[PDB]
Structure 1
């Protein structure tokens, strides 16, 4: 067996396994504890596995949130930093609320950070919002965009339907059958 990757996290490993199985590559996950997980494949599949790891840029980088840049361990933080932490917490709370709606599997939300020129004496600017979401198969997406827009509009003090962008997509085909073992 040939080593593809070592020292992976659990949530990196399960993503790599998922992407290899989709292309009919049988892979194995091994746990070394403090050394993390290792991924191995057979030689006939080695070439393909390498090319897919390249194409998808695996393993995935960790997920980024703006509050990571303003750790709140400061001695004191400016208005600019406080207003950033605030907005970054509202974004996460909204994504978690949308995941509870009917038939939504996952979503992402973005808010226009007015903080760029907070506290230069000038007045603030109206807010804008963007959302992505994934639906179960057979959902009337067109009829479901209205609900999302309606829900988002009243979460903020001044928002116009014109300023809300919504993009929806359906889930891909289910991967239920196991890949074939090399002869």
Structure 2
């Protein structure tokens, strides 16, 4: 019994555990009520645990979204500040929708953010798209990359298939074995 991380969120606790239990060390999530969770590993496993905290940069930051920097708390917002909150909402919605495809487990979608459509007289430049996707195993993984480029194309103003970069991959091998208590 020796602590690693306390005061963690519900997001951060189940992801630090899922790291350590992948690397054959058993974590013990202790709840502390109003303070947040706390993760304690065993004392022989403490050295390897603090290595993978440094290596995977745990505890994770909350998922940075672009609308979190341009909030609705401001009563007045610049026209750049509502295009960047619009484009933030679209790419959140596309990655909510790619996860509802067949085979896809996770998705992260990025938009080329136009800023100066009305600042210099230049017309709006072409929109660029980039998507990740994590698949189940056994997928014909070179063939779903044409569905997503078809789907992401007709979801925007004028994009080309050279402007959509889908970088997808199969998931890791399933962690199903329990780690195992160190005998002392």
What TM-score do you get using the length of structure 1 for normalisation?
0.95
Deviation of residue 75 (structure 1)? 3.1
- Structure 1 distance, partners of 2:73, 2:35, is 31
Hey, which of these two has a bigger chunk of helix by percent?
Answer: 1
* Deviation sequence 1:54-88 (CA, Å, 0-9, x none): 11111001111111111122232121111111111
* Deviation sequence 1:25-47 (CA, Å, 0-9, x none): 11211111012111112211111
Query: RMSD over aligned Cα, in angstroms?
Result: 1.3
> Gaps spanning 5+ residues in structure 1: where?
none
Deviation of residue 92 (structure 1)? 0.7
Deviation of residue 117 (structure 1)? 5.5
Deviation of residue 115 (structure 1)? 1.5
What TM-score do you get using the length of structure 2 for normalisation?
0.94
* Deviation sequence 1:80-133 (CA, Å, 0-9, x none): 111111111111111111111111101110110011564333221111111110
- Structure 2 distance, partners of 1:129, 1:79, is 22
Contact 2:26 2:179 in 1 (8 A): yes
- Structure 2 distance, partners of 1:136, 1:65, is 26
Question: Is residue 7 of structure 2 the alignment partner of residue 7 of structure 1?
Answer: yes
SS in 2 for 1:50: helix
Runs of 4+ that moved beyond 6 A: none
- Structure 1 distance, partners of 2:67, 2:178, is 41
- Equivalent residues, number: 183
- Structure 1 distance, partners of 2:13, 2:141, is 33
Contact 2:87 2:113 in 1 (8 A): yes
